[PDB]
Design a protein around this ligand. Structure first.
Ligand SMILES: [Zn+2]
Length: 357
């Protein structure tokens, strides 16, 4: 048996799909290669999280913790994200030639303002060298997000006061995890990109499961569709008030008032604000009245914003450690470190310390 491999110098949608679709319930060793770079990862299907984007099914895959590697697969796109030298790198491949060209143009465009000779380390269109004809269209893009911000001299977005505090409202580990829907609603007039949205959802889900063995208690089911609602101004607080009001006012949403809701967009709000949520608004026993709602950017350059806002929804406050997901400034980290926050989030999902981790 020769070990399955993915050549990142030529990685296409069909490469990722064929390899990931071969992953069984017992997992599969896959070698990631990039010229001299070589990493063996053990990949498994993520059975905890379901995603539909406008009814399109998206599957997630995980490496081991030591592998530092995540995958996303839809019919239309696939993503490999992993870390090298402590920097997050995404390979993004769309199946359809025209969509892939469009996506490559979209990601390339911001780098045409200013050019560096190290640009390739931040952003690269990947071409199929196996087509010795010499592929004209790229088959994927590679983006090093940490490096990309440095070249782009981005205007730095942040949280500021990104939550609003509201009045406050036998038990064992459940026989099956409780399904909690996270209903993500594409803001009227927003374009969001499937690879970007699913990456936010994956990081949000994984931030929960990493805490107190919470997969025992909850399995998150993300769905995305479009809402007629759009924020009336640039202000995040006013936007969130209107969004929650839009849910309550919609006869279509009657009977789903106990789920979690995000208004999503690609852009940000006034004061370069990344998102906003109602603090401590979801509890598995008392969830009601569309209280568990928030708003989030989904752009690639700000990974973990949805995770951070979901953190607030589940009760997490800002943490003191700059490496915490819940730090008060955006720092790109994707896990809760605060024991106080972990206990709050876990309790709201049905855990108590006697259950262990
Ligand atoms: Zn915050």
């Amino acid at each position: 048996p020769v070990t399955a491999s993915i050549d990142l110098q030529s990685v296409s949608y069909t490469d990722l799909a064929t390899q990931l679709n071969d992953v069984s319930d017992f997992g599969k060793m896959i070698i990631l290669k990039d010229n001299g770079f070589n990493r063996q990862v053990h990949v498994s299907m993520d059975k905890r999280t379901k995603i539909q984007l406008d009814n399109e099914n998206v599957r997630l895959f995980n490496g081991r913790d030591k592998d530092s590697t995540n995958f996303i697969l839809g019919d239309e796109f696939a993503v490999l994200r992993f870390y090298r030298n402590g920097e997050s790198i995404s390979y993004i491949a769309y199946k359809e030639a025209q969509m892939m060209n469009e996506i490559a143009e979209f990601y390339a465009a911001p780098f045409k303002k200013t050019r560096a000779i190290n640009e390739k380390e931040a952003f690269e269109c990947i071409y199929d060298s196996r087509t010795r004809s010499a592929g004209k269209y790229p088959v994927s893009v590679k983006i090093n997000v940490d490096k990309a911000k440095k070249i782009l001299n981005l205007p730095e977005c942040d949280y500021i006061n990104d939550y609003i505090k509201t009045p406050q409202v036998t038990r064992a580990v459940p026989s099956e995890p409780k399904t909690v829907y996270v209903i993500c609603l594409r803001e009227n007039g927003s374009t969001v990109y499937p690879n970007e949205v699913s990456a936010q959802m994956q990081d949000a889900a994984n931030s929960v499961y990493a805490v107190h063995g919470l997969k025992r208690y909850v399995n998150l089911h993300f769905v995305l569709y479009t809402t007629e609602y759009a924020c009336p101004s640039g202000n995040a607080d006013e936007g969130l008030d209107g969004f929650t009001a839009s849910l309550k006012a919609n006869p279509k949403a009657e009977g789903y008032d106990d789920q979690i809701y995000f208004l999503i967009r690609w852009g940000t709000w006034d004061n370069n604000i990344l998102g906003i949520s109602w603090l401590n608004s979801y509890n598995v026993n008392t969830a009601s009245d569309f209280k568990a709602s928030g708003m989030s950017t989904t752009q690639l350059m700000y990974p973990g914003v949805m995770a951070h806002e979901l953190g607030h929804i589940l009760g997490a406050n800002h943490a003191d450690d700059p490496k915490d997901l819940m730090y008060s400034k955006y720092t790109g980290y994707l896990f809760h470190l605060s024991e106080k926050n972990m206990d709050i989030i876990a309790k709201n999902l049905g855990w108590e310390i006697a259950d262990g981790d």
